[PDB]
Amino acid sequence: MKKLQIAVGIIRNENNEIFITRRAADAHMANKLEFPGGKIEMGETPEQAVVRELQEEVGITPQHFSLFEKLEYEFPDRHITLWFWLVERWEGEPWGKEGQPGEWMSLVGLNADDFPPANEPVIAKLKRL
Numbered sequence: 829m830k831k832l833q834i835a836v837g838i839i840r841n842e843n844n845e846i847f848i849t850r851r852a853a854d855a856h857m858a859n860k861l862e863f864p865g866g867k868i869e870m871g872e873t874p875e876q877a878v879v880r881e882l883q884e885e886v887g888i889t890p891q892h893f894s895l896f897e898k899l900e901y902e903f904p905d906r907h908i909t910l911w912f913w914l915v916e917r918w919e920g921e922p923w924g925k926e927g928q929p930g931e932w933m934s935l936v937g938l939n940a941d942d943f944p945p946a947n948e949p950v951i952a953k954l955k956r957l
């Protein structure tokens with residue numbers, strides 16, 4: 829079974845809102861809300877991966893970020909390890925740089941059902957902040 833290491837950024841502004849994108853209709857976890865992120869490539873670290881992925885997907889460079897959660901999830905056809913980085917400082921303004929929907933969402937209003945099931949404990953822990 830496919831095994832993947834995924835790095836994602838929880839992009840939180842000063843108003844307790846998170847920058848959330850929506851996955852394509854033909855992707856794994858299609859139409860789900862998501863933290864921007866992607867696969868950690870050979871020869872790059874989890875910290876380098878979250879920087880690169882956020883630069884590619886939403887056009888910001890995260891800085892002074894921290895590991896919020898690391899967890900593993902077994903999907904029906906793949907196993908992934910998710911590295912959830914809390915990003916509270918960055919250069920740039922996040923946008924749909926890859927043409928994907930993106931918008932700021934209040935932390936209190938997040939609905940874990942809208943995200944891949946792997947995100948359930950992370951969304952709960954975020955609302956604990």
Ligand SMILES: Nc1nc2c([nH]c(=O)n2[C@H]2C[C@H](O)[C@@H](COP(=O)(O)O)O2)c(=O)[nH]1
Pocket residue numbers: 834836855856857861862863864865866867908910944945946947
């Ligand atoms: N980018 C991103 N991927 C996620 C999240 N939660 C989650 O289970 N995934 C899974 C979906 C995909 O199988 C994989 C991400 O790979 P791509 O972003 O390259 O599609 O990780 C998330 O919050 N953000």
Ligand SMILES: OC[C@H]1O[C@@](CO)(O[C@H]2O[C@H](CO)[C@@H](O)[C@H](O)[C@H]2O)[C@@H](O)[C@@H]1O
Pocket residue numbers: 875891892893894895
């Ligand atoms: O692993 C993140 C963790 O490390 C600290 C230092 O203790 O931050 C360092 O690592 C981050 C990821 O590369 C950098 O963004 C940061 O600048 C660097 O100091 C903690 O702040 C953080 O919890």
Ligand SMILES: [Mn+2]
Pocket residue numbers: 864865866867885
């Ligand atoms: Mn991605």
Ligand code: NA
Pocket residue numbers: 865866867881884885
């Ligand atoms: Na990507």
